[PDB]
Write a structure and sequence with these properties.
Helix content: 10-25%
Entry title: Structure of Lates calcarifer Twinkle helicase with ATP and DNA
Subcellular location: Mitochondrion inner membrane; Mitochondrion matrix, Mitochondrion nucleoid
Strand content: under 5%
Number of strands: 2
Radius of gyration: 14 Å
Strand order of the largest sheet: 1-2
Protein name: Twinkle mtDNA helicase
Distance between the termini: 32 Å
Keywords: Helicase Mitochondrion, REPLICATION-DNA complex
PDB class: replication/dna
């Protein structure tokens, strides 16, 4: 289950990032396995597309993630991220693969951010109309 992961936003500097946008995005460091940065990699619903920890410090602390959250029905990287945590009701959206890049784009001057569960090398045809809406 994706809801099994906890949430924590303590004063930690594992990743050299600014939290001024993180509190806006609601992403908190889950403590199901470790204390690494674990943003809520899920959409509006509780789809078990993989809510593992993010690449804290971009060089360690679970740099890779999981493709599913629940025990059964392992999903692929066709899910979406970033745009779920933002309104995205505009025509200018910044596209990126890394979750940290999406968080930084959210921290930018109002530029919307949209990403997939593994947008670094994910299939861009899974949600082509969603990206083409802008």
């Amino acid at each position: 289950p994706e809801d099994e992961a906890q949430l924590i936003k303590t004063m930690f500097q594992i990743t050299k990032v600014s939290n001024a946008t993180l509190k806006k995005f609601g992403v908190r460091l889950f403590k199901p396995t470790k204390s690494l940065v674990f943003p809520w990699f899920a959409g509006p619903d509780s789809s078990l597309k993989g809510l593992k920890l993010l690449s804290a410090q971009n060089t360690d602390t679970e740099k890779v993630t999981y493709n599913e959250a629940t025990v059964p029905k392992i999903s692929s990287y066709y899910n979406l991220f970033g745009l779920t945590l933002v309104g995205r009701m505009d025509s200018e959206v910044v596209l990126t693969g890394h979750e940290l890049d999406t968080l930084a784009v959210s921290q930018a001057t109002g530029l919307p951010s949209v990403a997939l569960p593994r947008g670094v090398s994910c299939l861009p045809p899974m949600l082509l109309p969603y990206l083409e809406q802008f």
